[PDB]
Design a protein around this ligand. Sequence first.
Ligand SMILES: Cc1ncc(COP(=O)(O)O)c(CN)c1O
Ligand SMILES: Cc1ncc(COP(=O)(O)O)c(CN)c1O
Ligand SMILES: [Mg+2]
Ligand SMILES: [Mg+2]
Lengths: 398, 398
Amino acid sequence: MFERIDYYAGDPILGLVEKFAADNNPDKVNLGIGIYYDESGVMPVLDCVKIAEQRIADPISPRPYLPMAGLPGHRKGCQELLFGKDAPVLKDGLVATIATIGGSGALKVGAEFIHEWFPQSKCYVSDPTWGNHIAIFEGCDIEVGKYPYYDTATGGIKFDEMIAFFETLNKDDVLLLHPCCHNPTGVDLTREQWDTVLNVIQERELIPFMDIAYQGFGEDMDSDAYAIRKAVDMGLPLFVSNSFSKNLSLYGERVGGLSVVCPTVDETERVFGQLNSTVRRIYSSPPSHGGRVVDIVMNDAALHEQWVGEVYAMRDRIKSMRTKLKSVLEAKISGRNFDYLTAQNGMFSFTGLTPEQVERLQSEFGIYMISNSRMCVAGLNSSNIDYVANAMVDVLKD
Amino acid sequence: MFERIDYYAGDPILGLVEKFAADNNPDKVNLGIGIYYDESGVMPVLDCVKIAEQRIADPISPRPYLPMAGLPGHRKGCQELLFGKDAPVLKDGLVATIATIGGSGALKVGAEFIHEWFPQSKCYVSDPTWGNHIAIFEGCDIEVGKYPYYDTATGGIKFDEMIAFFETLNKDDVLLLHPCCHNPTGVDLTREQWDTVLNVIQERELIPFMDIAYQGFGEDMDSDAYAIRKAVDMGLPLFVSNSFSKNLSLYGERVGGLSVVCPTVDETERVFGQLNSTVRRIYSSPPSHGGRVVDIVMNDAALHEQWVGEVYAMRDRIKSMRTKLKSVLEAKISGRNFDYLTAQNGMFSFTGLTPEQVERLQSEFGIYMISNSRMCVAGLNSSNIDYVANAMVDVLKD
Ligand SMILES: Cc1ncc(COP(=O)(O)O)c(CN)c1O
Ligand SMILES: Cc1ncc(COP(=O)(O)O)c(CN)c1O
Ligand SMILES: [Mg+2]
Ligand SMILES: [Mg+2]
C-alpha cells in the first residue's frame, strides 16, 4: 500500500544526536543540538518555571480547551516581551497575537496565513538558516529562496549583496529574519544594518517575518528586540514568531507566539480572526500546561523579574564560554584568529571548521558539531572546555 | 495592508455559547457544548490523571523536546488501546504511530500525509459530521464531500444509500469514519453493518480513516474499537486518529494519536518517517505535559485500570441520563417511541426535535441544543434532568 512513500532521511540535527548517544568515547561531547545546558551540563529547570508549575500543580484543575489563540495572558506576555510593556502599538490594539506550538507552530501558522492571503508571496530565508524554516514554509506550498547573508570568506555578512538582493524582491515578498542570535552562524546585523535593512524593506514593501527564539541571549531583552521594535516604529507589516523554548527552558511544552502588527484596528480584527481560523484547522487550540507557565511567569511581576535574571545568567555563561574558548584556543594555536567566537551572539557559533575537520572531531574525539561548522556554545562547560579546545587544536592541523 | 483578509465568523458554536451566557432564565441549561461534565455538572479531573500529574510535579523535571512522534509510551498506549494489548499488528511492527495535538492534530497530520502522497484522493465525512473534520481536510487542499449517514425520517442510518455511495468512490478515496459514539447524532453502525461497510471499503480499495474521540463511552474499550480491529484483521490500509480529550478529560493538554496500519514493516518505516517529517514541518514536536500524562496513565497498570473504571463511570452516567430522559418522554408522550435515545451511544444525541422545537426549548426554557437537534447528553445531571425532560415533553406535545 505505501511502497512509494519515500523514507524520511530524518531531521539532520537529530540523526546527529542519535549518532552521539551511540559513541562510547568517554570524553565525548554534543555541540550539535540547540539546547541550553548550564555549567554542570544539564538543562536547567528555571526557578520561576518551578514556582509557576507548583502553582499549576496545586490544585490540579479541570483541563478545558484553551481559546484557539491561547491564554490571553500568554498572548499579552508574548506582546510585551517583544514590543515592550505598554508599547503604543499594543495600547492601540494594533497587533494580532496567538499562543502557538513553539516558535515552530508560529512560523507554521504565519506561513499558512501568508500562503492563503498572499498566495503569490515568495519567502526568503537567510543563507544559511535553521533548516526547519525552509521545510515549514515549503510545507505550506510557499516558494522559498535564500537571501545572501553569511560570508564564508570573512565570517561577517554579505551586507551589500544582501541589500541588493532585497532590492530585487516584489511587493509583499516575505523575508524571514533573525532579530538577533542568528542560527546557525551567530553573526548578527548591527542596529545600523537593521535600520538599512528595514529601510529597504519599507521601500520595497516586503513583509518582514522576524523569528526570535533566543531573546535575552544576545545583549538583553530590549536590545535583542531592536529590529522588531524599530519595524514597528516604521509602520512595517511585521510578522513575529517568538519561542519560549530556550529562554524559558521549556522546549517540550511547546510555547511560543505569533504576532502580526496591523496598520488599523479593523485589520487587526481580520488578521486575528484568520489566525484563529488557521489554528482551528490545524490543531484546534494550544496546550494548557505550557500556556499557564507562560501566562504565570510573564505576568507575575516578581516571577517575570526573576525569569529575566535567569535568562541573563544563561546569556552570560554562553558569553563566558565564548570568551574562555577563544582565549584557550588563542593560547594554544599560534597566529590563528578566533575573534569570531566573541563577535558572534547567542547559542550558536559558526566555527569556520571544515566539513573534514568536523569529521575528525567526531571520529578522533566524539565531539559533535554540525558539518556546516555550527557549534552550540551552551554545550561547552568548564568540565569539557579543555578537551574540546584541545581536540580543535589537533584537528586544525592535518 | 490587510484590508482584504476576510473576517473570520468564529467557532460556529460561539453564536450559541454567548447567547446562552446572555440568557436570563435562571434554569437555563447549555446542552449545546461538546465537553463531558460529570454528575455535578463540571468538567471532572480524573483521579488517574490527578495521580499522573502529581508524579510529573515530583520532581519538576527538565523539559527537553519530545521526539517528533511523542513519547514512546504515549505512542504505545494509543496502539494498545486502539488495536488491543499485545495485538498481532503491534507485535508485527505494522502500525506507524505518533502522538498528536489532540485528535485534531492527528486528523491534520493524517490529512496532510494523504494530500502529499495520495493527492487525487477525496475525503468523505458523514452526513452530518463534527464540522471541524471538514475544515481540517479542506485546509490541506483535500476536496471534501459527504456520505449519506443519518436518516432524518427514521432517526436511524441511511445504510443502503451510504453503501451505494461508497460503491461510486475511487480507489484510495478516504472515508472519515466514526467507529462509535457518532458525533453529532449518537447513531452508530451495528457490528454487522461495520462488516458490510468494511467489505465494501475493501472491495472498492478505499482508505478508511477512523476517528475515535470517545473510546470507552459506547460499550467498552474493546468493543468501541471493533471497527478498528476488524479493519486491521481484514488488512485494510487503516488510519486512526484517537483523542484522549474526553476520556482523559484532558482537552486543553492536546493529547491524541495517529496510527497508520501498514502491510509490511518496511511500509511502516516509510509511513512513520513521513509522519515525523509532517510533524516537523508543522509544530516540530508535541507537548510534554499531556504526553507524560498519557504515557503514565496508559502504562501504569493500576492507573490504567483506574482509568478504564473512570471512563466507564462516564459511559454509565450518560446512559443513566438517556434512560431517565427516555423514561419521562415515553411516560408523558403516548404512542410515540423513544428507543433511539438509548440505542444511540456516547455524549451526543440527535434528539429528533424539529428546528422549531429546538428554538422553543431555548426561548421557553433557556435549554440550548444545536438547531439540528444535537444535545450533549453529558450536559444533563440530577440537577437538570427533570427540568430538561419535562421541557422537552412540553415542546413535543405543544
Ligand atoms: C531560528 C529559530 N526559530 C524558531 C525556533 C523554534 O523551535 P521551537 O518550536 O522549539 O520554538 C528555533 C529552535 N530551533 C530556532 O533556532
Ligand atoms: C468525532 C471527533 N473527532 C475528534 C475530536 C478531536 O478534538 P481533540 O482535538 O481535542 O481530540 C472531536 C472533538 N472531541 C470529535 O467529536
Ligand atoms: Mg537555576
Ligand atoms: Mg497546504
